[PDB]
Design a protein around this ligand. Sequence first.
Ligand code: NA
Lengths: 250, 250, 251
Amino acid sequence: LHPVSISLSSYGADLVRSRGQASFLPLLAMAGAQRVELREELFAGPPDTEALTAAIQLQGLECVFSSPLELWREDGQLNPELEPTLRRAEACGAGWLKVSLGLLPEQPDLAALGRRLARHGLQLLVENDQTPQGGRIEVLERFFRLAERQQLDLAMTFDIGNWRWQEQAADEAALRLGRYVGYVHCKAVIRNRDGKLVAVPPSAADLQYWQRLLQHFPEGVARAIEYPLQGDDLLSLSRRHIAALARLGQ
Amino acid sequence: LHPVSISLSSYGADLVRSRGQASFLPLLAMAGAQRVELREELFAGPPDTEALTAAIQLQGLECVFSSPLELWREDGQLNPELEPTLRRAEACGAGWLKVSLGLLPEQPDLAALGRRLARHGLQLLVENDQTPQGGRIEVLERFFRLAERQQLDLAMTFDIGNWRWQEQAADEAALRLGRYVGYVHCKAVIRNRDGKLVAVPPSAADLQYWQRLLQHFPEGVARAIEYPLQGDDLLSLSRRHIAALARLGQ
Amino acid sequence: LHPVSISLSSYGADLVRSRGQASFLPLLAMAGAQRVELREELFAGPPDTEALTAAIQLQGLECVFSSPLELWREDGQLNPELEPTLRRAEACGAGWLKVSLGLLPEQPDLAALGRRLARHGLQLLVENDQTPQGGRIEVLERFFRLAERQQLDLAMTFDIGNWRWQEQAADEAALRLGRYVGYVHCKAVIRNRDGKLVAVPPSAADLQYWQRLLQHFPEGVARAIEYPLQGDDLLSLSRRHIAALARLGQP
Ligand code: NA
């Protein structure tokens, strides 16, 4: 089996806020997950980070801290909230911080980025988002090429569904960006009756298609569920969805 | 279940012209179809539009009228056959007229198009065809963008197979044009042993692919059979093909 | 069933070189293949061309001879090794000679190529390779378009996996080049844990995708296993793999 993560936003923001994120960690371990993705927008709440760290450690889970933070500001400077967010993430027991790109300047100071990352013990993940600045193949390809040149402790999170918001083809993205991918965010996307894009659980067809996309990324890369998980028995549901994802490969 | 149409060309041009298109209406209704797509080229002489409209209504079907007319002439003017075809379609009972684009000029008179459409009671549908002028993604994107800006009462018919004639990817077309799609033409396409592209009935794999394409169009969009339906028992065959398409998507 | 070929490189180059390519023909015929693809690079010494041809004919197999030869030299001239390679292919009983493109010049002498090829019963196939000069859609499309204008009876070997090495989409390749394809090389490609591209046997999803790619090529085109075939029982392994390829197409 390949390593599987669950983004707790999958369970619904209201439910997660009400029950607290730490309460989902035993559920994830019991369902067979290897990693949890925490969500900054989902603490009620100023968290007991100590209690949260102890919970992750007890379950033997890896932990990704996901933030809506955009790395680069309109003005061309690294987001001053980067270090405060890294501290937050580390305090919660995360091994990775996941962010969006923001607006990549013509001249990014990746040396500066490195120095800030070096003050903390987290690998940085940068995810394609739904915006023009952070969600399009061309600028992301530029960022990852450069980042690799200066050898940053950073990797791409390839979000399968987000490309849809920028009318970018996931297959083309995978072909061009797949060598940089360290984490896959899985969701299916449909256009609803009013023409609006909405994230949904995968069909059997989507899953087979995702297996083909995964051929473009290093074998065994961690894959995350970030789509609705709703049902009366969340443990059994999560287990069945983890198994389906873990099984994707050659 | 999603609404399903059958294009009567599916039954074979010679057979349909022989028996007449009206004779297939009870078949379509009994087989579970919600619309009939009449084909201008399959009328053996001008129809009694009153008997036709009455037969369609008796069967509780809606009706798309399909013409091979190209909307824009080589010289950049609208095809003068547009309003005569709109009048014939409307008289036969259709809710939509389906046409091809023709050669979109540098400065298309979309206001004049709107004025002509406003004189009739049908929605205009423009389908991708098999030609360079009417069958390539870039020009169709330009057309539908400009039509939406003019707020015209028109939508795309997305023909899954026709892209093959222009060596365009349906997946790419669906990404770029999906927001505009109000009707889907379903057909599988193979290159035969002689080298010629031909429309064929879908395999299981084809249906799964089409399910993924439909994610790009508003959920529950009407879908039409436009591939060969040939056999000893057209009711049974039609019923099965309709059922497979009615439940595609969910 | 559609005709299936096995490229003998599938069995592992060292194993094949040591046993000789002729020793695999009974296996191919018993497992249900229609065609063997011989590999010039898998002859450990000069071939016994008469015994090879006799072994192919005994088994009732057809034969494609694969050469790493590049058709067009850097200086724009046709590779002078083409004639001896065509004769070698014929000596080994081949109905097709498969080569790489090389560097396509601005004004290739396709007329001369056609006159050369017309002296031979076999057909020339040009395969997409893993190089910029021979593995990119645009130049290959230019080659086949020029060949079609000159009315040459040559065709393409569409290698499904090779496109990955040049970061080219196989679906786009199949759309733009499909009309030219007379032979298909099947392999799946993944990035390994180290990030290196490697050719591998297909998953069920791969096979389903390949069925869709085949829609772009003339129906019934011969398709070849060109991916690892390893096991204690090559006969049953080969038979299962040939079967899965032979049934790919429309119902
Ligand atoms: Na090859």
